Design a protein around this ligand. Structure first.
Ligand SMILES: Cc1cc2nc3c(=O)[nH]c(=O)nc-3n(C[C@H](O)[C@H](O)[C@H](O)COP(=O)(O)OP(=O)(O)OC[C@H]3O[C@@H](n4cnc5c(N)ncnc54)[C@H](O)[C@@H]3O)c2cc1C
Ligand SMILES: Cc1cc2nc3c(=O)[nH]c(=O)nc-3n(C[C@H](O)[C@H](O)[C@H](O)COP(=O)(O)OP(=O)(O)OC[C@H]3O[C@@H](n4cnc5c(N)ncnc54)[C@H](O)[C@@H]3O)c2cc1C
Lengths: 472, 472
């Protein structure tokens, strides 16, 4: 059973499976190790894919069940939710995407190994199967892509039945009457918005003073919060959770308090969602025997070439430092594999966008106003509301705005922050501009197609550069 | 009552009203003259705005009335069309956009003169009102933005009742049982697609050998045609219309033959849509008395500052050469007015995008394969199908692809052509790339937000640059 490889990838997540494919394309004999039943890691199985599927489906449910479709001349007697059918469509997307990775591995002649991976030597990886079966691989370089896992709340045991994490919250069998989310981060706000649309009464409790996680612009966060409240999403900010106990009748009691201290309360809910964070996963990887020490938060220290302390062992994705996003792990996998083949390795995390797929969407890349103030950077602001964008008005969906942050002297774009329709696609134009160091005037002078949401992005850059836009 | 002005703009369409606002913001005393009851010209009143409104409205009708919403767990007993309510939604959007132009003229202190403008001298414009009153404007500069009108078909009379132009097709009071469209250009394909979704039996008769107009890539046109045909849109290509007769029964008989000439045939329809094109509009503007001769197609010849043969008289928009598009006219108005203030004037018609708002959408910018072969340019092709895009599969909407055309030696992007979901927004990123002269590798190396349709644009550039993509 011995196999020999040039590169051995542990984990089949976005970082792991993309890194594996690129290595084969570079000419390396490549092996990939996955312990779970399917390829694709967190994002495809319990992450991006199922959550975005329910966000899109719940959004169309809201459009038909509400007043939107009636205003367009689409008349329906009565709209019913079929949660089982909605969940199967989610499952059909997960199944096609997880299955696609195996087909991509086969097309590129990438060897798939089923089992739990352990690095037993400098040039050796051993995969153990479920039955006790064993697989040893002799390889020159190792790439660690073991990813992340849920962060447990100390003193709450998640049973994935009525006190749930992101995984269980994605597969609820019926709509809860009242739901509590622990943490108003990107994950909590998306999942809470799904169940809010489907009929649940959702309240979010957050220790910090804002929604959307770290890196989000504060003005964007407050406006995003006001819009969600108008939808029915409730928030208890600057409040801490002390404990949660499931009562005998079936209702969970969550004890909350003001984060600073005081204002004690207990809230009861049918379903409790705990998503306060994620953390790198290195359990049973045996780093100690290799001498690879973890940082205080559990990450593998790595250098700019994504080498660990041992030159032939690398680490990428959520298991190393940086923002825990799928496209971030996908890029580290590509360049790390390119670096192994002698190529250059460079990545700018300031050019990494973040997207929240609620409705309205939120997206941003680069620096926020708070970051610029802390660094002492002199900047100017350009804003353009979606109420003045022709596509948004024609659609009758005009929440939010585009905010551009530009250098005061050079007019260079330092940050783009979008709240409203089409934020996700729009931030990609912003990332391309930041990669090139483009100015606000540059974007203002590029001819944007009439009746696109991206015209708001152009006009906001015009307001930051010229001082005024045309349509507002 | 004579008025003194620095700039006098004739026409309040996208070129005219944008040029008027920018000139006022630049410090000029500005006057804008409009003969029609509302501001906004063709695009806002009978053009982009009402057609795109009906396109998205009929699209939502097709998903609710069709198989899409039922597969997402959204269950409805009976879906019925209320055409008057749908036309009401269209009219409400037209009224909000035209009214917004009046407010922007008020905010920027644009003098709005209602009436028919005529150039009565080199530095004089005379507006004649409906009641015969006259308003004389003594002005330093004149800007002609008199726009376009529908091209009449020789031997066919349009009454806007059962033989209609685009204007009449936008306000039909009943879904025709059968409709024939003369012209399979961008306008014809959109309007035909709207009425096809609402129940019409639609056939388009096109003189050329492809659908989508001039400049569209042939491979994209053939694939776009195949998808529309499977939706039920029928096409008779390389076919011209020789005549149309209103029969006694109330149905129109359309006589057709091969565009080059051949055996005649008859097809019958309830409503005939004539959109074979549009032509520049300069009627009774006083060009003959000034010495401004028109070109063979009716356009005003202008130099790089958009000046006519008379240096202080300018022309922009649909009345001059170049793509007859709203964002093309808006940009010409901006730079022309900036040139009047001494600034540089630059527009690259190769970087001006084109969008068709069907479902699937079509969008492109730069050069097609035919143009590159015609120019003798050695290029390489990168393609990525939307079937391999994670966002498309999660949505279950995977028609089409992204095709990138790159220079064979320098890897520089020469053209981007998108057929599928979100092409309209995606093309604006492509326009910025062309503006900077980006390479395929540059775009592939920019970090695109995961779960966006724009990832297909990135991977198509990776396929063109490296030779292979990751997920296909
Ligand atoms: C609900 C949810 C929604 C999300 N939505 C988004 C979103 O919209 N956009 C975004 O950018 N990010 C999103 N994320 C984050 C995203 O999923 C992660 O950033 C990404 O999956 C990290 O990829 P990775 O390869 O580094 O780790 P993972 O995706 O976790 O992959 C790790 C893989 O390695 C395997 N593995 C682990 N240890 C071993 C071992 N010892 N031996 C063998 N195999 C092993 C695991 O089984 C797994 O298959 C979301 C996350 C969640 C939970
Ligand atoms: C059905 C349809 C759909 C379209 N969809 C799109 C689309 O999605 N995207 C796109 O980019 N383009 C689209 N177009 C094209 C777009 O409408 C035009 O390119 C654009 O309107 C041109 O702007 P303009 O200012 O040059 O001219 P116009 O819009 O024609 O405006 C000219 C104005 O000047 C006025 N005028 C003329 N002569 C005089 C005079 N002597 N005195 C006073 N007033 C005068 C006219 O009444 C008119 O209001 C569409 C066109 C149609 C017909």
């Amino acid at each position: 059973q011995p196999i020999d490889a040039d590169v051995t990838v542990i984990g089949s997540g976005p970082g792991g499976y993309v890194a594996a494919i690129k290595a084969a394309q570079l000419g390396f004999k490549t092996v990939c190790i996955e312990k779970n039943e399917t390829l694709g890691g967190t994002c495809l199985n319990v992450g991006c894919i199922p959550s975005k599927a329910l966000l899109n489906n719940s959004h169309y449910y809201h459009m038909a069940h509400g007043k939107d479709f009636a205003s367009r001349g689409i008349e329906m007697s009565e709209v019913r939710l079929n949660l089982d059918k909605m969940m199967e469509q989610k499952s059909t997307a997960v199944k096609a995407l997880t299955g696609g990775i195996a087909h991509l591995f086969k097309q590129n002649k990438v060897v798939h190994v089923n089992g739990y991976g352990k690095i037993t030597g400098k040039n050796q990886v051993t995969a153990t199967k479920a039955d006790g079966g064993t697989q040893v691989i002799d390889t020159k370089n190792i790439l660690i892509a073991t990813g992340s896992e849920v962060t447990p709340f100390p003193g709450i045991t998640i049973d994935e039945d009525t006190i749930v994490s992101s995984t269980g919250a994605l597969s609820l069998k019926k709509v809860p009457e009242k739901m509590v989310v622990i943490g108003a981060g990107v994950i909590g706000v998306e999942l809470g918005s799904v169940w809010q649309r489907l009929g649940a009464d959702v309240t979010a409790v957050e220790f910090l003073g804002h929604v959307g996680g770290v890196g989000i612009d504060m003005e964007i966060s407050k406006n995003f919060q006001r819009i969600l409240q108008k939808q029915g999403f409730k928030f208890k900010l600057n409040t801490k959770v002390t404990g949660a106990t499931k009562k005998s009748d079936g209702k969970i009691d969550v004890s909350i308090e003001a984060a600073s201290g005081g204002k004690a309360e207990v809230i009861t809910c049918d379903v409790l969602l705990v998503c306060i964070g994620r953390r790198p996963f290195t359990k049973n990887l045996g780093l100690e025997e290799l001498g690879i020490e973890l940082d205080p938060r559990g990450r593998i220290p790595v250098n700019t070439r994504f080498q660990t302390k041992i030159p032939n062992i690398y680490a990428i994705g959520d298991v190393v430092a940086g923002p825990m996003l799928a496209h971030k792990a996908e890029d580290e996998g590509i360049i790390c594999v390119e670096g192994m083949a002698g190529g250059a390795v460079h990545i700018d995390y300031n050019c990494v966008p973040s997207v929240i797929y609620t409705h309205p969407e939120v997206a941003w890349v680069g620096k926020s106003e708070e970051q610029l103030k802390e660094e002492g950077i002199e900047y100017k602001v350009g804003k353009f509301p979606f109420a003045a964008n022709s596509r948004a008005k024609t659609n009758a969906d005009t929440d939010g705005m585009v905010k551009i942050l530009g250098q005061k002297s050079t007019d260079r774009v330092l940050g783009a922050h979008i709240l409203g329709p089409g934020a996700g696609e729009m931030v990609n134009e912003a990332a391309l501009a930041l990669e090139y160091g483009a100015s606000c005037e540059d974007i203002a002078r590029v001819c944007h197609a009439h009746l696109t949401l991206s015209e708001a992005f152009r006009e906001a850059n015009l307001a930051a550069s010229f001082g005024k836009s045309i349509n507002f």
